[PDB]
Amino acid sequence: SMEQVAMELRLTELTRLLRSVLDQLQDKDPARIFAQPVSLKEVPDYLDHIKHPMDFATMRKRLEAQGYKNLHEFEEDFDLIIDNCMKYNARDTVFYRAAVRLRDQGGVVLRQARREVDSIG
């Protein structure tokens, strides 16, 4: 149908906006601490601690499959990155500190993304 197409064009445009958002959030991680999944070869007990792992490469796969229906779903995954790290790692670690800085700096980007998503519809 014409409606299904219009729907698909909306999703494609949302995907375009979320790709830009993801690139902006990932720039706030210049150390690349959050770029890839925590390695289960190197942290073999990780899944005993963290039940829903997340990272930027995994979000990017979902994004490119147009797997985010709305900004809320995207934000859920970004929050998993931060929250998983803040649980697994102690306060006095470069990892925890990196997550705090990513959260703080990402807030600005996500604030305007919500306005753009509502605005453009």
From Swiss-Prot:
Tissue expr: Highly expressed in testis.
Compartments where found: Nucleus; Chromosome
Bromo domain span: 9-113
UniProt cross-link Glycyl lysine isopeptide (Lys-Gly) (interchain with G-Cter in SUMO2), position: K41
Disulfide bridge positions per record: none
Top-level lineage group: Eukaryota
Function: Scaffold subunit of various histone acetyltransferase (HAT) complexes, such as the MOZ/MORF and HBO1 complexes, that acts as a regulator of hematopoiesis. Plays a key role in HBO1 complex by directing KAT7/HBO1 specificity towards histone H3 'Lys-14' acetylation (H3K14ac), thereby promoting erythroid differentiation.
Assembly mode: Component of some HBO1 complex composed of KAT7/HBO1, MEAF6, ING4 and BRD1/BRPF2. Component of the MOZ/MORF complex composed at least of ING5, KAT6A, KAT6B, MEAF6 and one of BRPF1, BRD1/BRPF2 and BRPF3. Interacts (via PHD-type zinc finger domain) with unmodified histone H3. Interacts (via PWWP domain) with dimethylated and trimethylated 'Lys-79' on histone H3.
Protein name: Bromodomain-containing protein 1
Residue window of the full protein shown: 555 to 674 of 1058
